[PDB]
Structures are given as structure tokens and as C-alpha cells.
Specification:
The chain is mainly β. The chain has two domains: 5-174, Beta Barrel (Cathepsin D, subunit A, domain 1); 175-330, Beta Barrel (Cathepsin D, subunit A, domain 1), CATH 2.40.70.10. The chain has helices at residues 114-118, 144-148, 229-236, 307-310; strands at residues 3-9, 17-23, 28-35, 41-43, 68-78, 84-96, 99-112, 124-127, 156-160, 167-171, 184-187, 196-204, 210-218, 225-227, 243-245, 250-254, 262-266, 269-273, 279-282, 289-292, 294-296, 303-305, 314-318, 324-328. A seven-stranded mixed sheet has the order 18-17-12-13-22-14-21. It has a six-stranded mixed β-barrel with strand order 2-3-8-4-7-6. The chain has a four-stranded antiparallel sheet with strand order 15-16-20-19, with no helix packed on it. The structure holds 3-amino-5-(pyrrolidin-1-yl)-1H-pyrazole-4-carbonitrile (2 copies). One 3-amino-5-(pyrrolidin-1-yl)-1H-pyrazole-4-carbonitrile binds at residues 233, 236-237, 242-244. The PDB classes it as hydrolase. The entry lists the keywords fragment screening, hydrolase, inhibition. It forms a monomeric assembly.
């Protein structure tokens, strides 16, 4: 089998992407944030504290003839950025772009933190990292990909995120029309539960490529590109007037600037992020200070190849026995 679904930016800055997902019988369609940096499929629901719902579409398991309470199971997730959610668990039928999994764990939120409440466009998360990070207790549950994998034509999914435009998540096949040149594959460590790999270096603008190993994670659920402070300083040094602002929370730059591109290495290959992709707009409405899309990972403990990086590529998440990651230009 295969599946193919369109993923759409939630706003004009590509802060996140939402993908429609069918849950239950009859189908309840929710728009979920596909997240290769976490491993829980959780949703706003009829069980979510009323004051914590503000415009989201909710899953109502009592209206699904295929929903079953997973007795005794609870879940609780605290994301690196301080957001959180928790609740109980149903199994139900979940379909993405025509690919159906029966008995998928659908984690129903009883509580969500304010950042989730405030984003009316995101109805939940669909985790695509390794199932070892799944938070359901006392019996850990599998991700949608892990459940689907054996049935797929090939044990892979691909992320093709758009810049200020829709893109695609495919399951089970590689669309050879969706990229240019060749796909370069690179090793993955699953030791921390992530799609963790090592970039071979970087360049700023038309500058020389610096060969240096940068370990990090391919994380569709993170907006920005978080890299070591040395690398990030070298980038922003090429933008007149750029500075790191503790009050704003990272590097900002004059909105009148033209940003240089940023290149990252994948083996001997190179992925070029255009300068425009690194512009996250005014820090507040009407400001002439703009927020940068490349930021230091120093306070995080891991480098993160988030949407800013991934949207410059066609990315293959190869879930074979020894997983790998592939990147192509597009
Ligand atoms: N922090 C964090 C994070 C990450 N590294 N990947 N996806 C994250 N999400 C937080 C909000 C929903 C998804
Ligand atoms: N201002 C500023 C600043 C800072 N506090 N740390 N790094 C900075 N930059 C790196 C090159 C551009 C400015």
C-alpha cells in the first residue's frame, strides 16, 4: 500500500504545517502537525478541558463505531520548547492520504498547554520519530508509520515541505518526479529515538564550504534551523545590523536586509537554503526588526534541522531494518 497527503503551512511564515488525517468511523478529519521529532499521535477531543479548546476541530470517540478505550493507558508529553499535553488513549482506524491503519493508538487530550490552545489551526500531532519515544503508559504504543510499515510497498515516508506553499507527505514510495538530481543517503542513529544524522558541513552565501561534522535531528515539528553557536555567528556576521537579542530570544536583523543563503552538507552533496527562507518577519507587528530562521542550539542540547532546512529538500525517512535519511535538491 501507499498513501499521499498534502501538507499546508498554517500561516504566512510557515510556522508549522498541517496535514488532514481521517480518524474513526465515520471519518472525523483533523488537521495534524506531522512531527518527525516526536512519537505520539494525540488530538484535541471531546475530553479536552473546555477552556483549553479555542477553535480546534475535536475527535469525539463516542461517535466512532471503531473506537475502543485502551484500558488503563495514559500519556503525558513535555516538548523541548516547554509545551505539553496529556490524557487517555483510544485505538481507532486512522487514514492518511488513502493509507489506513487499524488499531492505531489515538491519544486523546484532557489537558493542553496554552501554546496549543492558542493555535486554532492545529488539531493535534502525528509523531513520526521512533516508537521508543512514545509516552503511553503502562504499555508503550507504536507510531502510525511503525504500524503501517509492514503493509507499505517500501518501508519509507518522504517529506516535501513547501516554502510559503503546500507540499506533500508520501508513505510507501519515493516520487521520482518530486526532486532534481539524485538522493544522497546518510546514516541515522536511533539511540535517542530521533532521525539523528551528521551533516558534513556548511557554507554561508557564496562563501567557501567548511567541512565539519554537525550531528543533529531531522525534525519536521520544529520551525527553525538550530545549529552550533559558531556556525550561527558566522551566518549572521554576513548580515549588516544583525545581532543576538536576549530580550527577543535570538538573532534578529533589519527587515531591510537581503539575507544570504545557507548551505548544509549531506555526504558529498549540498542542500542550499535560499536567504528568503531564513526570514521570519517582524518580531512584532509593524517592527523593522525581523526574526532570523537560523538560531543557536546552545541552550537546547541538540542541533535541529527543522522546517527551514527540510523545506529546501526532498527528504526520505527510510525505516528499513537499518534506518537512513536521504536528501535531494528540488
Ligand atoms: N519542542 C519541540 C518539538 C520538537 N523538537 N519537535 N516537535 C516539537 N513540537 C513542539 C510542539 C509540537 C511539536
Ligand atoms: N550583536 C550580537 C551578537 C551576539 N550577542 N552574539 N553574536 C552576535 N553576532 C554574531 C555575528 C553578528 C552579531
Amino acid at each position: 500500500s501507499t498513501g499521499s497527503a498534502t501538507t499546508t503551512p498554517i500561516d504566512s511564515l510557515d510556522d508549522a504545517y498541517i496535514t488532514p488525517v481521517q480518524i474513526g468511523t465515520p471519518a472525523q478529519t483533523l488537521n495534524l502537525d506531522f512531527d518527525t521529532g516526536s512519537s505520539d499521535l494525540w488530538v484535541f477531543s471531546s475530553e479536552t478541558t473546555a477552556s483549553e479548546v479555542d477553535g480546534q476541530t475535536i475527535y469525539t470517540p463516542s461517535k466512532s463505531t471503531t473506537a475502543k478505550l485502551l484500558s488503563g493507558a495514559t500519556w503525558s508529553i513535555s516538548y523541548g520548547d516547554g509545551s505539553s499535553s496529556s490524557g487517555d488513549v483510544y485505538t481507532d482506524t486512522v487514514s492518511v492520504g488513502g493509507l489506513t491503519v487499524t488499531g492505531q493508538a489515538v491519544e486523546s487530550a484532557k489537558k493542553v498547554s496554552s501554546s496549543f490552545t492558542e493555535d486554532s489551526t492545529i488539531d493535534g500531532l502525528l509523531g513520526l520519530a521512533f516508537s521508543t519515544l512514545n509516552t503511553v503508559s503502562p504499555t508503550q504504543q507504536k507510531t502510525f508509520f511503525d504500524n503501517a510499515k509492514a503493509s507499505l510497498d517500501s518501508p519509507v515516508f518522504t517529506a516535501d515541505l513547501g516554502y510559503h506553499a503546500p507540499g506533500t507527505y508520501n508513505f510507501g514510495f519515493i516520487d521520482t518526479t518530486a526532486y532534481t538530481g539524485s538522493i544522497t543517503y546518510t546514516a541515522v542513529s536511533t539511540k535517542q529515538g530521533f532521525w539523528e544524522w551528521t551533516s558534513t558541513g556548511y557554507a554561508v552565501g557564496s562563501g567557501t564550504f567548511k567541512s565539519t561534522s554537525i550531528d543533529g535531528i531531522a525534525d519536521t515539528g520544529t520551525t527553525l534551523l538550530y545549529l552550533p553557536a559558531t556556525v550561527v555567528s558566522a551566518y549572521w556576521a554576513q548580515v549588516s545590523g544583525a545581532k543576538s537579542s536576549s530580550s527577543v530570544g535570538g538573532y534578529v536583523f533589519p527587515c531591510s536586509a537581503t539575507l544570504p543563503s545557507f548551505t548544509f552538507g549531506v555526504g558529498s552533496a549540498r542542500i542550499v537554503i535560499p536567504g528568503d527562507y531564513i526570514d521570519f518577519g517582524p518580531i512584532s507587528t509593524g517592527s523593522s526588526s525581523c526574526f532570523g530562521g537560523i538560531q543557536s542550539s546552545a541552550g537546547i542540547g541538540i542541533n535541529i534541522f527543522g522546517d527551514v532546512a527540510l523545506k529546501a529538500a526532498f527528504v526520505v525517512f527510510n525505516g528499513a531494518t537499518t534506518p537512513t535519511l536521504g536528501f535531494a535538491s528540488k
